[PDB]
Amino acid sequence: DKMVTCIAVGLPLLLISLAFAQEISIGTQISCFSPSSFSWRQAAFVDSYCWAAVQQKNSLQSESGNLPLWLHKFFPYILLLFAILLYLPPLFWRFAAAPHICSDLKFIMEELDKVYNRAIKAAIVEQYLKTKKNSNNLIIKYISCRLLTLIIILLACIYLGYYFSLSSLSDEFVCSIKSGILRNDSTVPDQFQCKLIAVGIFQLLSVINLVVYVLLAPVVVYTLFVPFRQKTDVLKVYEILPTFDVLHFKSEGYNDLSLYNLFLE
Amino acid sequence: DKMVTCIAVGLPLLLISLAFAQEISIGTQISCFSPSSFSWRQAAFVDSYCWAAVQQKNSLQSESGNLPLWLHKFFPYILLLFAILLYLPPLFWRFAAAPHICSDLKFIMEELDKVYNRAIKAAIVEQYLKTKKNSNNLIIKYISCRLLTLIIILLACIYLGYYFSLSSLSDEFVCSIKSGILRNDSTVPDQFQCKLIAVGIFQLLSVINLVVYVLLAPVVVYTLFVPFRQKTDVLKVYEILPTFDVLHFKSEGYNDLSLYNLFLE
Amino acid sequence: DKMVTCIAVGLPLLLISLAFAQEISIGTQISCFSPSSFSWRQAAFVDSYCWAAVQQKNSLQSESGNLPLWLHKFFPYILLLFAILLYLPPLFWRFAAAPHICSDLKFIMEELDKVYNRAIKAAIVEQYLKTKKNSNNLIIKYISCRLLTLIIILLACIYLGYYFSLSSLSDEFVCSIKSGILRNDSTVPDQFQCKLIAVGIFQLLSVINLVVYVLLAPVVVYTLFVPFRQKTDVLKVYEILPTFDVLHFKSEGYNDLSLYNLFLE
Amino acid sequence: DKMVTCIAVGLPLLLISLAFAQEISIGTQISCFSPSSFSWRQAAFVDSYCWAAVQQKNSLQSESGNLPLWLHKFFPYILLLFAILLYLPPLFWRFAAAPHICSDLKFIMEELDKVYNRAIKAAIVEQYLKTKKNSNNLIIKYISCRLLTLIIILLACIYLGYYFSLSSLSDEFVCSIKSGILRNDSTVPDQFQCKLIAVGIFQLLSVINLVVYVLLAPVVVYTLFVPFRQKTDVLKVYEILPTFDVLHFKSEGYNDLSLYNLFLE
Amino acid sequence: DKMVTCIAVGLPLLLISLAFAQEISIGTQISCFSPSSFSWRQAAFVDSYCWAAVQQKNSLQSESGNLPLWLHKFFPYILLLFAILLYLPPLFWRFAAAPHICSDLKFIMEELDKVYNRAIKAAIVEQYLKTKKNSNNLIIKYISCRLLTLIIILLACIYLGYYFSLSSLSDEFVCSIKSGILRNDSTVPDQFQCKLIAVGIFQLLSVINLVVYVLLAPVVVYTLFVPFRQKTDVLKVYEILPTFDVLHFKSEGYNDLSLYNLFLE
Amino acid sequence: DKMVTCIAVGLPLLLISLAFAQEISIGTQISCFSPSSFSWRQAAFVDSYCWAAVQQKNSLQSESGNLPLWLHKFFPYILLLFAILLYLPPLFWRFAAAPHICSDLKFIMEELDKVYNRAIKAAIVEQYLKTKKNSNNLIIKYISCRLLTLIIILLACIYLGYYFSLSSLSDEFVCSIKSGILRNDSTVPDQFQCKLIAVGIFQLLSVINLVVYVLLAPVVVYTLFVPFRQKTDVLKVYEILPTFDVLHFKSEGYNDLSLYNLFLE
Amino acid sequence: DKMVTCIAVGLPLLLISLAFAQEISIGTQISCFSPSSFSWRQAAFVDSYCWAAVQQKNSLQSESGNLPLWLHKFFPYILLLFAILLYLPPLFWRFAAAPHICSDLKFIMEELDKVYNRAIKAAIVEQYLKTKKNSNNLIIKYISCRLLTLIIILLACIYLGYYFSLSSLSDEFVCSIKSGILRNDSTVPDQFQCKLIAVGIFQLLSVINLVVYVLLAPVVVYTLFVPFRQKTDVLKVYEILPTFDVLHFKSEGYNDLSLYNLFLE
């Protein structure tokens, strides 16, 4: 549990703290080039016009190549989704298996105090491996979120891995008010070479979250390999090995593991 | 309870966190095109004038087609309503059935310790199925909110499903101060091609809440199908099957379900 | 209690959350039309002048018809009053009847454990209906707030019902600085067709609170009808029926209502 | 206690919530009429000059009649004083009589369990009226704050009652920089017809707090009339009647008042 | 304790709430008269220049009379000092005498239960006045803060009493940039009749805190007069009378003072 | 402990509250003299340029004398360091001696209840002075922070004592953009007599923290003088006298010090 | 534990408080030199353009020498990383060894109460050194983070040590809009000698965090030297000496270390 909950608590909390670190350094959102003192409010109009008309013109206006790319407006907006989608398998395990694993904890704790009163009588345990001898496909419904956590983290490395080769010239784009000319065909200049403020802190943030998840994907791969090195195959681990390390979850007793020191002599 | 409370807690909390994610990225609300440096305050006057006169002119001024459409001013305002209307059936069940289901929990817990002291005597339960043999239309008054939660989520998919085909050209609209000409008929230009700032984050938010509710409406449909696969029809499930899974609600005991392991041998 | 406290907790909390939803979308408060770049501060002076001189000129300056109507300056200001006036009858019942109803709860709980020890002896209750046989006009002093809650909710539907037919042209009004001409009679233009920013979110908020209270006034009317269908008239319900449903208030016991299951066989 | 603490808790909390309702709708504080684009900062200078020179010129500059009236700068500032001066008699009673009334509560609770063990023996109280037969002028030191709460509420109705007849033309006042002419006698215009922004929400707030206190002053007058209708004069109520209703303060027991039901038969 | 802690808690809390009441109504800090549209930033430069050069020119530039008077820049800054200096003697008594007075409370409570078990035996106390017969100059180290609280409150009435006769014309002062002329001797006007914004709420705050402390200094004088009217001089009160009223500090018992009612008969 | 923790809690809290009192009255940070309406943004550019180029030019540009003095940019920045460096010896004693002094407290409390049960037997203690007869250089590792607190407070009086004689003319300094001339040698004026806003509240804050620490340095000197007047030299105080006053730390008992009253007779 | 947790708690908390001390004194982020009143919004456009185009031009535009150096945009951004990377080894030890060291604490506490009941019998312990005689490479997996904390702190002194010799002239850089000329080749000036606002508080913050870590790196080196001076080599310390000082972790008893005082006589 603890090596799983370490990642499953610290990593979306890391990503939401990093999203807030983005959110402090916002300032404004976009700047456009107003044509040399024609007003103040017309400049903010053109700026908000082009920041609203990024997604809208499906034709070619930036001549960038695959220019319908939605121009990375949404990194707090995407990172919120990715943090809560990594947060949902802990919520699923904590709201659909924690009473059942608490009953399993009560079972193994009455089993260990049964061993304790067997040692008290030394001044039945033999059946409890047979109590967990059945099929029990139900703990494989718990193991599926451990693969489902690898699913979102793998595509995040493909999502942010798209963000590097995007960011050559996907920031300075050319925008217009063509329907503004369509009113009068008289006055306003056509194109304004605007530019987003965001990639100065966004592009060098796709170093960090990418290199964190790539250097942690084998740690989540390693979550499905302790069931291989303790005499049982993945078809046969069904109840023991997803409880055997979970025997170390809450606490122990004065002789839960000191018998090994006692049986040593 | 738990598969119901999972959705009924996480989903309006999702929608209110997404409403706050909208509320951080507001900035301003609308920009209008002031006619080339005639003042500063007259520009904000025209801008607030047209943002106040969206709903008012019932005649044709945008030439958009069904242009009395109220121009999506209200998405935090609508989403607040939809979050609290999804929040109200949990409030109704928690304030009108939780003492009665707590009495049901006390009844089934004294029933299970009656089974426990029957096992203690092995070192009356036979009547308790007959205690719940009556009509009891009262739990069908609890099942109605499970349909009433499907009611609001279904129309939300029709509400946001309206929002896509709306958003072709329901953003750039044309506005005027015609009563301003009616003062003097002298000076001010007539029409100003204003534009809302909102749909750049609103329209690509009607992807998310739509696709979440469509991929969760069969999960709320599935809330009325566990009463079909356990030997009783929906006319006959009245008390057992809305308590049978609710037997797994708070906790269990050392032998509430370990008898199956004991009766196995 | 619970069907009463459901409304009496959730509805003024709804109205104060909706007042805060108004308070987020304020922006500015009013815009006026400054005459074409005569200053910046004179524009804000004229704007604050007319937003301060709404109530003051009792003569006809808007030519609107019943134009001394105070021009809806006060909807957070009125809604705060209406929320706290709906909050005061719960405060009155909780600070003037909750120790007495706690003594009533202690009386009925010693009555039910008297029934319990009567069942223990089966291995005086007959007097307790006569303990509550008197006049007791004092619980009618508790029933008066249930009518007093209907009083404020009924006039709120007449208050907001006034707000629809008001809002035809009670927003664009004409204002002046006539005493400003009285200084010099030289320079300033006379009238400025100002306009409030508020009714774009205020008028379509008098849909919501109106239709909520109209669809909840029969629910508060229904609070005085359970005392009619249980063999006693409103002159004779004095103590039983305002305690009979209040017997279901805190909790019950293992045999407070399981005797009906026991007496069934 | 409870009918006293109802007012003494809810009413200064009402006035401080209403002061904060003023504090949200502030905006700016005063506007002055800058003479037609002479600068921006000189306009704010003149505005802050006249908002600082309201109290200073003791001679006649507004020609309003009793124009040294300090021009209602201070309504959050005065209302804070009036709220804390209504808050101080509850603080005085809670910090100078609550241990002594807790000892009185301990005395009457050991008196009622003395009655309880007298009823247990039925399977000395006769002295306790003589324990409270003395003079005890000390509870009259508690009754003085009930008159001292009427003192501040009465003058508040004279304070706000002054505010109506003030507000005819005590808002638009005329101000100058005469010492500014005394530098050069050259350039600046003399008088500026400024105007406070405050009375649009201040004057129609002296409806509310006035009509609340006038419709609650007989409720505080009624706090000194229950000691008249229970066989003792105000010279003779000294200990019984300011404890007799305070017998209903914390709670009761199973037979603190059920003896009346028992003695009925 | 309680009549001391009433003042010692409520009065610096009053002064810090009044300091925050100042802190809400700040707005800006000073306005200066920019010479008729020479820039915007030069106006704020001159304004911040003169608000920084108030204390600096020790020569005569205001021609006010004793014009090195530092021009009351510091009333939140001074009032913070005066609040914490009135807060420090409660901190000193609570951190240097509260365990010793808790031991004194434990001593007098075992003394009163010794009287209680003497009354139980009626079905040694005679030595305890001799236990407190010594010199004990140590409680005079507690009485010194009661004089030290009078020290700061007395000079505060001389500090704020200086503030009235100051405020005739200590607000409008004349300031320059003479070193600015020393650059070029060409362009900038010399003197600017600036004015502080502060005394409109500062001077009529030296009514309030002055008249509060003057009407409370005899209440702190009265703190050293109860030791005179109970048979002992101030040389002989050393332990009894600073504990005799402190016998009424925490609570009492069922017969701590009801013996007087018992010995009455 | 208590006379030490009084200073060690109240004094860095005083300095951080005074740093926040600085932080409220910031406003802007520096003003520069823009040459008579050449733009707005060039003025803020020059102002931020010179506030960034204070430390950079190591040559003579202010002609002030020892003008590389870094111009007191850092008083919240320095005061934060000095507050946390005075906060660190309490952290060191609380995280490296509080369990050991809690064991010492447990030892002296079992010693005092050993004296208590000796008095109970009157109806071994003689060894406990020999238990603390050894060398114990380890409490001298606790006494070193009491000298290390005097170290930082002494240099603070030399740090702020430098700040007075600095502040003659270390505020108005002359700055330029010489590399700006190096672009064109055409347009911009060379020098701008800027001035910091800070010393109006900074210089008259080096009165307060200086005079507080000078009037408290003998109080920290007095922390190493109680070990001289109780029969042992500083070489011999090792365990008794840094525990003897620490015997008065948590509490006492009914006869921890009342034996002196008992042995008096 | 405590000398380790002192640094491991206080030092990243120091660095994050110092990062927030940076975050309060931000103001703006960069200023550029707009060419003499050509607009307002074009100035902010050029400023945001060059603050976005710092990293982008990989060719020579600053002529600084190794000018692709990314120009220290990221000191809250880097310091957040360094604080959480110093925070992660405490998280690793607290989530992967604290239950095992709690079992070790339970083992040594039952060992000390075994010594206690041996002393009670004086009115088996001999095996417990042999219980910890094995290899136990597992505590060397705890000692690796103590080296891994030295890893990040060592490179931080090389990271900030790079920052001094960088900051000669890595602040004033030259930037252009060359693609802006490529539109028209007509109007805009080419180069703008902009300058970062950050190094006035950033460069003299690389004094502090550098000199803190250099004066604390031997304290973390000293964390691996107590295992050398207590008779065992680093190959043989495996369990005793990383538990021997951890015997002083939670608390002790009345005779856990008072036996040394008892065995002294």
Side-chain angles (χ1 to χ4, degrees), chain E residues 5-208:
Chain E
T5 54
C6 177
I7 284 93
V9 161
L11 272 298
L13 276 177
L14 169 64
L15 267 298
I16 203 165
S17 87
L18 176 141
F20 277 161
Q22 270 177 350
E23 275 294 324
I24 299 299
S25 163
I26 296 293
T28 69
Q29 291 89 343
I30 188 171
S31 65
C32 284
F33 186 70
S34 83
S36 314
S37 288
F38 284 167
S39 173
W40 186 88
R41 191 59 94 177
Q42 72 94 26
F45 170 78
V46 168
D47 180 78
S48 174
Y49 185 88
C50 287
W51 203 75
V54 162
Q55 42 83 23
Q56 185 173 1
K57 179 167 181 188
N58 214 6
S59 178
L60 317 175
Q61 86 255 38
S62 175
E63 49 269 8
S64 299
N66 288 319
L67 60 96
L69 55 94
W70 289 352
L71 278 302
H72 43 59
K73 284 207 177 312
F74 313 106
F75 272 183
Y77 185 81
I78 285 301
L79 211 65
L80 198 81
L81 283 168
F82 271 53
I84 65 189
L85 283 190
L86 260 67
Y87 185 80
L88 276 190
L91 183 137
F92 180 78
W93 161 68
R94 202 260 308 271
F95 284 163
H100 296 256
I101 211 61
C102 184
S103 66
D104 216 0
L105 187 131
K106 282 269 147 176
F107 284 164
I108 65 180
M109 83 197 311
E110 64 92 23
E111 272 144 30
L112 63 88
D113 59 57
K114 181 64 212 65
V115 177
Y116 281 168
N117 54 63
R118 191 185 181 197
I120 283 162
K121 292 186 291 287
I124 324 172
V125 291
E126 60 92 20
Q127 75 205 356
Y128 284 121
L129 55 95
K130 298 111 177 173
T131 62
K132 268 78 191 169
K133 202 59 67 66
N134 55 2
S135 72
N136 204 313
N137 203 3
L138 190 145
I139 318 295
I140 322 290
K141 204 159 74 74
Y142 156 73
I143 215 71
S144 74
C145 72
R146 286 179 189 180
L147 276 174
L148 196 138
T149 42
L150 260 184
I151 284 166
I152 308 170
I153 295 170
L154 175 67
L155 56 89
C157 302
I158 313 297
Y159 182 74
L160 277 78
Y162 181 68
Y163 198 58
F164 276 165
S165 65
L166 177 142
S167 299
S168 46
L169 199 62
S170 160
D171 185 68
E172 294 90 357
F173 78 109
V174 192
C175 169
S176 296
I177 309 100
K178 51 167 83 50
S179 54
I181 301 162
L182 288 176
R183 324 160 179 152
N184 50 341
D185 318 293
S186 185
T187 47
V188 190
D190 314 339
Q191 66 268 7
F192 304 113
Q193 296 210 2
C194 309
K195 181 178 179 179
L196 206 58
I197 206 181
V199 309
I201 79 170
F202 278 13
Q203 196 203 356
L204 267 295
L205 189 135
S206 53
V207 170
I208 284 186

Side-chain angles (χ1 to χ4, degrees), chain D residues 118-182:
Chain D
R118 191 185 181 197
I120 283 162
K121 292 186 291 287
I124 324 172
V125 291
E126 60 92 20
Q127 75 205 356
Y128 284 121
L129 55 95
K130 298 111 177 173
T131 62
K132 268 78 191 169
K133 202 59 67 66
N134 55 2
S135 72
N136 204 313
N137 203 3
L138 190 145
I139 318 295
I140 322 290
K141 204 159 74 74
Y142 156 73
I143 215 71
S144 74
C145 72
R146 286 179 189 180
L147 276 174
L148 196 138
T149 42
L150 260 184
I151 284 166
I152 308 170
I153 295 170
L154 175 67
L155 56 89
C157 302
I158 313 297
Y159 182 74
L160 277 77
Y162 181 68
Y163 198 58
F164 276 165
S165 65
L166 177 142
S167 299
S168 46
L169 199 62
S170 160
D171 185 67
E172 294 90 357
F173 78 109
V174 192
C175 169
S176 296
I177 309 100
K178 52 167 82 50
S179 54
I181 301 162
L182 288 176

